[PDB]
Amino acid sequence: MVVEHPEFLKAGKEPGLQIWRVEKFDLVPVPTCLYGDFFTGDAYVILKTVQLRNGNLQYDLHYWLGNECSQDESGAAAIFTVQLDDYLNGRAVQHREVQGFESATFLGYFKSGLKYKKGGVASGF
Amino acid sequence: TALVCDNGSGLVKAGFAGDDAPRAVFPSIVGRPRKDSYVGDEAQSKRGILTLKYPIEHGIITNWDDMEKIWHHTFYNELRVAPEEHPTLLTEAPLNPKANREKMTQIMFETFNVPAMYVAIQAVLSLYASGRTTGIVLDSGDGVTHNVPIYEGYALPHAIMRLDLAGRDLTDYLMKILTERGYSFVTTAEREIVRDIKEKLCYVALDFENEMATAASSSSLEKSYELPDGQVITIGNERFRCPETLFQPSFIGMESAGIHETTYNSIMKCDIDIRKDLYANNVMSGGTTMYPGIADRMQKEITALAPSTMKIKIIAPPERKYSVWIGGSILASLSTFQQMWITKQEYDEAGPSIVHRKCF
Ligand SMILES: Nc1ncnc2c1ncn2[C@@H]1O[C@H](COP(=O)(O)OP(=O)(O)OP(=O)(O)O)[C@@H](O)[C@H]1O
Ligand SMILES: [Ca+2]
């Protein structure tokens, strides 16, 4: 308000799936080849952009929390989500996704099935 | 480096953004000659020659001159920092009056010279700390209890509930019933002992009636407590009678409904399309929520109040005495938070009114 972050400038510009990982209090893009491989020690923010026939863009924001992620990571993913929504004129619908309890919709973003892997980036505290 | 100050009616929580806990915790008190002042423990110790005062009443700052002392002590005595060098985040009560928010902004910029500041609502920060952007918070401290429902990052002012029954009132109550049992706790020094017993031996009963009866039978609920003076006392049904007051304010002669009801009630004041989210995301926050058994009783208490098929959930993190502070430490630490601060530049241009447009 008004955020200057370069990832913010890139979010929701066109239909597709964008995935960022929380890395010591920053929003860091995930390599597109790695989509669906989630570190259970980390937390992520996903933006799903779909085309409307009125020419406008629909938005769904989901923050995903691994079983062993630290508090600073889970807290930051949630805040980033709020911020991304506001920047998008509040047009996004927000969703909380917990490991092993994800929603059917989110699970469907990943055509070859999502996968869990142990580990992650270290805490930022 | 950013600082986070969480100013409570009973305790000030202070530290540095990026730390996983407050560095300084101390009583929010100012003592003056019955240097020209003391703050915190120092004040309490020399209480015999001082007049003691609490500048925050029920979460609301009410004595500006005394609050500046608190802040000064915080900066210079506890944190050992030069205020003019650090952007500073402060917390406030929900429904904090317009002119109070302006006052805080003015003092920081005009008296302390901070390069930047920001005010955030205590309950919202707790929600952030639990990794949620939607839920309803039960925040209970030493001076105030609130229910604060939050959607997609923002409180819903219309549905927030405030209750002037909390920790201090519980400590006072345990005092009265304990002397009622035959002991005698009346003095300030004695208030202090009871508070320690309140925090060490008390708990919330899952079924208050059975608990009473089970305490009148054997003596399996009874516990021993060694006084500072060496005497030993035996504490009984008061362990669970004291926090019962949170659910039955009638105990202390209060007319309000308990915290389970005020919770249900705040929720029902919200748009029907979000209630389920609320019901499933009940976050506990603050010191007076630390009684053992508190999360199970509330879990019991609200499934009774809500439709039998409602998915209900209470979240009571071990560290919730600091959840507010931790929420702030995270918020102020984020890469994206840079442009959120109110600059000295913005203040000089607009004045204290700027706070209403920069901080929700
Ligand atoms: N383990 C414990 N069990 C019960 N009560 C406790 C526990 N630890 C602390 N308390 C109580 O919590 C209160 C301090 O809580 P807290 O720091 O959250 O309050 P505050 O921020 O100063 O007040 P408020 O938010 O009401 O303005 C005291 O009343 C204290 O006795
Ligand atoms: Ca991690």
Ligand SMILES: [Ca+2]
């Ligand atoms: Ca939105």
Ligand SMILES: [Ca+2]
């Ligand atoms: Ca508080």
